[PDB]
Write an enzyme that holds these catalytic residues in place. Structure first.
Site, mmCIF file in Angstrom:
data_model
loop_
_atom_site.group_PDB
_atom_site.id
_atom_site.type_symbol
_atom_site.label_atom_id
_atom_site.label_comp_id
_atom_site.label_asym_id
_atom_site.label_seq_id
_atom_site.Cartn_x
_atom_site.Cartn_y
_atom_site.Cartn_z
ATOM 1 N NE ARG A 170 -2.367 -2.199 2.491
ATOM 2 C CZ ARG A 170 -2.048 -3.675 2.138
ATOM 3 N NH1 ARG A 170 -3.017 -3.793 1.012
ATOM 4 N NH2 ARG A 170 -1.289 -4.353 2.651
ATOM 5 C CB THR A 171 2.981 3.120 2.327
ATOM 6 O OG1 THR A 171 1.953 2.735 3.243
ATOM 7 C CG2 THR A 171 3.560 4.608 2.689
ATOM 8 C CE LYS A 209 29.640 -0.978 -1.739
ATOM 9 N NZ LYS A 209 29.632 -2.034 -2.786
ATOM 10 N NE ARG A 243 5.841 0.625 5.401
ATOM 11 C CZ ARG A 243 4.782 1.156 5.236
ATOM 12 N NH1 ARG A 243 4.295 2.248 5.811
ATOM 13 N NH2 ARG A 243 3.704 0.491 4.705
ATOM 14 C CG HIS A 284 1.450 4.884 8.458
ATOM 15 N ND1 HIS A 284 2.116 5.485 7.446
ATOM 16 C CD2 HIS A 284 1.012 3.742 8.233
ATOM 17 C CE1 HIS A 284 2.141 4.629 6.332
ATOM 18 N NE2 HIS A 284 1.297 3.669 7.133
#
Ligand SMILES: Nc1ccn([C@@H]2O[C@H](COP(=O)(O)OP(=O)(O)OP(=O)(O)O)[C@@H](O)[C@H]2O)c(=O)n1
Ligand SMILES: Nc1ccn([C@@H]2O[C@H](COP(=O)(O)OP(=O)(O)OP(=O)(O)O)[C@@H](O)[C@H]2O)c(=O)n1
Ligand SMILES: [Zn+2]
Ligand SMILES: [Zn+2]
Lengths: 310, 146, 146, 310, 310
Positions: free
Chosen positions: D54-55, D84, D105, D134
């Protein structure tokens, strides 16, 4: 009452020239005359928290040849210390309420001395504690050096290999420094070099030692050549430049060797002694191995018997 | 005097930046009797010293043996009724127990329920301490590195 | 009884037991200045107090207010050439940055090179602390750990 | 420039009823009238250090639907942070020299605040930092709540499920405590109950909230029944008693449901909303999902354009 | 068509001072004056068979900033090479029938040369083949060095760190040995020292180089202090002695630093450049990173456009 009766055998430091010499005297005796019920009715614990073929199977065979019973484990995976998170301290406390002597091998240094603080009056014999001490090895090496050379004084002894992590050469240099006139030659990668704590002691006693870059530069002068394995499992990953053997003995390298010289190895060996050495009169590592039966029967007998008459 | 206590201890000629470790180390602040601390005072020969004054309190053996390893310079003064009844500078022990921590990570001392113990060989160079368990000897600098 | 001081800062009236804690929470000892601490002095006002005199050192406004988290009733005395030129008093800071560690395990502050910061809140008994990053509020007791 | 131009969007707690209202106004506008080139020549980074369906896709489709370009990663594993060993702080430092805005996110709470100290002048849009905020979820929840109930004030709102790690309900309880006379019914297991710090804020604003042990207790009374998922990934082992949905909803339950009420869920729904609810008048969670496009492109537009869209 | 139109870019050793100069000219131009549709209607493949944050995103943003379309993979795991066992050679054979240019990062050295035998007419741009070349890194390093020092000739250049697997310093020592009177100071551990074949080339061109055991030894003298990372992933187990930064730099060190000098790093930096350097006049590595956009889109433009941008 013999001097080693009920003693803990942990570090070669704690033993004297006399203690060592009593086990070799006893060893040669049991070798000439078996005693199959000397330890009849004793149960002994063989506690190996780290891999072994020689110390465990030589120890258990020595116990059987004298009449003792063995209880133990080949790996702690199965113990409640391994599965249920019990301490070593607690494992030794209950095992000591069951048995007459504890033989143990363990991966951390100091485990053995730790155990004696919890064994009550039960003798703990050290089979190896990480890279620290390995006294029972040294006893069977001193026995082999004596059989082959007839003296443990004024020898020329070279130690080749991983001298840093090698509990074997740690105990052996300490024991040989208890005799007069022995000259040490050390051939190791500098990263797997002999601890300065051993060195300081060789300097505190005025013993002569030297370092060499090659085996060939001392071959001609040694009585004993003591090869060792790179303790891969002990190496810090900084030392992985060192996993493959730097000094590898091949049959041809013995060309200018003393006819009396012996190549000793604790074993296991990996690539460092080429199998072609095996066929020479200078190879004596499997004889040395067989000699762990006499040295380990002698030690068990003295620790568990107040007086021996043999 | 340069403060004054009837009964108590005055540890003095403490090296600059050690005095405060000693308050933490010997747990001296869990107390109720008066403490005078003078951080970074003079001391002719070695310029800046610390001084701690625990009124009506004297140190247990272990502490003065530890003091020998953290502040060999320092002097401990037992004052009874303002009388500097005794003034002694700490000599090194044979063994240190339950306070040092072995540099060898593979020492069994870490994992198991044991009080540590160290042998104290005074080297002409420095102090070499030997772990009871793993038998490695170390420099006191190594061991005491905080 | 403690000392004469020409110029610096004398945090006076520190509650007993909080004087060592302050000297270690805000790096006050890490100096080369003469500090003279008197712990467990008689007060009357309270039974016992603590006191710190830091010579030739002056604290900023926020510096002094940070003290309100442990020593609200302290008096921060500014002294210049033996004259008490100023008598400050810690109010609550609006944020305390850099000295506390968030009790939130999965807070970004533990992994990255950023200083800590908490917004201070006078909630309803104790002082509540809101992390800048994970935004969770914790009572101040908690933030001063275990 | 409009209130939110170049403005970072990290927590609902930094916005105002005015900002939230603006973003919904613009969403209403944009839904009615598309702006295809609105962000023509802008490149946005889509940086998901954590899973998303979704997001991440609503955000990237919204970027595409305004003419923007998207660069980024759906996984940290093959970034140099991932392989790394680079810090987030330096990831943000270089990625700031490339794109016009960063959508991020991350699994740690506060990752986006950390990001705004290094993004320079670039806005960081929080796509979810662990269990904290959120804010974009909430703007499309407000858009869907106002779409269905015709208001954001004087609503009866039941938040069911995992209220502790529900970054979604953290933000949504905070957006709705900006409007008036909203009534809160919190139905969690005790373990995964609403954070205190939230409750405190409700208390100071004098919002009426109450705790219920059942959907039935509140069913007849509510307008928005907003369901959540047990944030399985974020639970402590201690907490694994609550991996399953305590409160599961089926269509039968809606029997005594107020005819205006809507069932909302941020999704994924696992076992908590039975597939038979999918055919009731009440179920609105897929419409809520689609409402992500409008709220998301209204946000983008405001943060990257000075001029209010119309 | 301009010198580099349809030309593959695999090693700095195939370019000339003229090519390098052209790419920087165009970068200077493009930075001043954007060309948004320059590559409108072109599709480029971003094929990273190895991790990247910088190269992959600077390259794809540069493609987007000239109107191009990007297709590709950040990981080989879900390609048919990755799962169905396909050769690189056939990957390149089909991907050539689809895109206009291929940007490729691969773990094997020579992967890009291999790719030009199968890309047909399509240019392959080397994004780093193991420890060999990184030609795009170098063009943005030359762009940043000329930006700061005003010249690419007669520079004192200290390359610190892992000089053996540093694909970056392989290429950069080769780009700078094309200009004149550049002075090289190489500071590696012995294990990870600069390749012989590089040194030889310096010798034949009669460039003065020297080896130093310290940053302090060269600090006062240098203009560009270019720091590298121990390419942890590429080390042998033997080499794991050198996993940590031998030479670590902190702000104190800059005390006797020439006021023009810049600290450069290809990045990621792990422990070798202390975060306090981040506030010194000297630190330039994040600006160097951003300079990737200009050098990268100048390259793209030249290889895909006949007509020199202006
Ligand atoms: N009633 C007392 C007596 C002494 N002291 C402190 O204890 C120490 C006494 O030691 P003394 O040897 O008498 O003073 P010094 O000779 O100057 O110290 P040193 O000989 O070690 O240089 C001094 O630091 C003094 O401040 C004290 O606090 N209260
Ligand atoms: N040259 C000075 C001046 C002041 N002080 C300290 O500053 C503190 C407060 O200033 P002062 O007014 O001199 O003492 P008080 O009047 O008692 O302050 P208060 O009544 O608030 O306790 C005192 O504790 C004193 O030790 C000092 O040590 N040396
Ligand atoms: Zn130890
Ligand atoms: Zn936090």
């Amino acid at each position: 009452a013999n001097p080693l009766y009920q003693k803990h055998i942990i570090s070669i430091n704690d033993l004297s020239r006399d203690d060592l010499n009593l086990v070799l005297a006893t060893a040669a005796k049991l070798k000439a005359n078996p005693q199959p019920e000397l330890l009849k009715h004793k149960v002994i614990a063989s506690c190996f928290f780290e891999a072994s073929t020689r110390t465990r199977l030589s120890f258990q065979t020595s116990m059987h040849r004298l009449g003792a019973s063995v209880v133990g484990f080949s790996d702690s995976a199965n113990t409640s210390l391994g599965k249920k998170g019990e301490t070593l301290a607690d494992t030794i406390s209950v095992i000591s309420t069951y048995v007459d002597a504890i033989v143990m091998r363990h991966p951390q240094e100091g485990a053995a001395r730790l155990a004696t603080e919890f064994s009550g009056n039960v003798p703990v014999l050290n089979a190896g504690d990480g890279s620290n001490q390995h006294p029972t090895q040294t006893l069977l090496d001193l026995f082999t050096i004596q059989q082959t050379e007839g003296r443990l004084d004024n020898l020329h002894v070279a130690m080749v290999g991983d001298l840093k992590y090698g509990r074997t050469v740690h105990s052996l240099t300490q024991a040989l420094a208890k005799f007069d006139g022995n000259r040490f030659y050390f051939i190791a990668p500098d990263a797997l070099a002999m601890p300065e704590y051993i060195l300081d002691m060789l300097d505190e006693k005025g013993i002569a030692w030297s370092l060499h870059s090659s085996i060939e530069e001392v071959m001609a002068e040694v009585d004993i050549l003591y090869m060792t394995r790179v303790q891969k499992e002990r190496l810090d990953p900084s030392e992985y430049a060192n996993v493959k053997a730097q000094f590898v003995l091949r049959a041809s390298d013995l060309h200018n060797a003393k006819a009396n010289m012996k190549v000793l190895h604790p074993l296991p060996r990996v690539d460092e002694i080429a199998t072609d050495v095996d066929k020479t009169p200078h190879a004596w590592y499997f004889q040395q191995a067989g000699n762990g039966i006499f040295a380990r029967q002698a030690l068990l007998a003295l620790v568990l018997n107040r007086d021996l008459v043999l | 005097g340069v403060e004054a206590i009837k009964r108590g201890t005055v540890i003095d000629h403490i090296p600059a930046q050690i005095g405060f470790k000693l308050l933490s180390l010997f747990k001296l602040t869990e107390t109720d009797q008066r403490i005078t601390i003078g951080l970074n005072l003079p001391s002719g020969e070695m310029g800046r010293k610390d001084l701690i004054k625990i009124e009506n309190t004297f140190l247990s053996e272990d502490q003065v043996d530890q003091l020998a390893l953290y502040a060999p310079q320092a002097t401990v003064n037992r004052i009874d009724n303002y009388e500097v009844v005794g003034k002694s500078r700490p000599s090194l022990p044979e063994r240190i127990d339950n306070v040092l921590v072995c540099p060898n990570s593979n020492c069994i001392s870490h994992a198991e329920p044991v009080s540590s113990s160290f042998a104290v060989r005074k080297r002409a160079n420095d102090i070499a301490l030997k772990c009871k368990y793993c038998e490695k000897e170390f420099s006191h600098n190594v061991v005491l590195a905080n």
